[PDB]
Structure 1
Amino acid sequence: SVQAVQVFGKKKNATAVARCVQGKGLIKVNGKPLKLFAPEILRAKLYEPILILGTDKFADVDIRIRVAGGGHTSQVYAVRQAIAKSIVAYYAKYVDEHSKNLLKQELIQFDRSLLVADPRRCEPKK
């Protein structure tokens, strides 16, 4: 009955659950707002999907994120991955596939790591 989408985000050892529901427009990380949770210089890494997609896409959703593990940098990268993948999955399920494809195209044109986490394996020059 309720519109709800749960999306994970991943870095070295920092993981993020983001549940996106129908709402008024808030984004909370660990119960505190997104403008509070980061080091003061990496909030520009957090605001990257919102500024790519515009605020009109985030006008309708409410995203709640939990993070665990990692350091400050790994947790910030996990939060921005959870934000971007979360709004793309909500627009996949509950509005049109053309809007899903437009959001995916804008995010992939900026940075692919907002959608697909690339782990660093060990394969040096063999």
Structure 2
Amino acid sequence: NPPVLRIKVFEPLFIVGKENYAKLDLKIRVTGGGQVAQAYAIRQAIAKALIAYNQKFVDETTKNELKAKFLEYDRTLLVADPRRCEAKKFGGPGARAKYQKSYR
């Protein structure tokens, strides 16, 4: 649906060649977050799916080569980003900001 992000989601395919996915069929279910966040979740899911599949039904040196190719371009392809929203605190409209102080 966010068409500008499509080539970002497709970039796991082109990082190693579409032939690494030619004999593979995927079925992804996305049920959280916003819309741009789901784009990064699918990127992780596609990249990990190739890595996990080549570990289980292919030898290791292919998997290590594939994961090495993923890592040398972008690390977050295979590891999740741990950043999460901070809790709101009283006295301010956000995590860190605070209401204006008047003296006179």
Both proteins in one fold, TM over 0.5: yes
Correspondence for 1:115:
78
The correspondence for 1:75, drawn from 38, 54, 70, is: 38
C-alpha RMSD of matched pairs (Å): 1.2
The within-5 A match list for 1:1-126 is 38-120=1-83
Report the Cα offset of residue 118 of structure 1: 2.2
Unaligned runs of 5+ in 1: 1-37
Q: For 1:56, what is the secondary structure of its paired residue?
A: helix
Q: Which has the larger radius of gyration?
A: 2
Correspondence for 1:13:
none
One-letter amino acid of the structure 1 residue matched with residue 49 of structure 2: S
Q: How does the TM-score come out when normalised to structure 2? A: 0.77
One-letter amino acid of the structure 1 residue matched with residue 24 of structure 2: V
Q: Which has the higher helix share?
A: 2
One-letter amino acid of the structure 2 residue matched with residue 102 of structure 1: E
Correspondence for 1:34:
none
Q: Which has the higher strand share?
A: 1
What is the aligned-residue identity percentage?
53
Report the Cα offset of residue 52 of structure 1: 0.1
One-letter amino acid of the structure 2 residue matched with residue 118 of structure 1: D
Report the Cα offset of residue 53 of structure 1: 1.2
Point out which structure has higher relative CO (alpha carbons under 8 A, 6+ apart): 1
Report the Cα offset of residue 59 of structure 1: 1.1
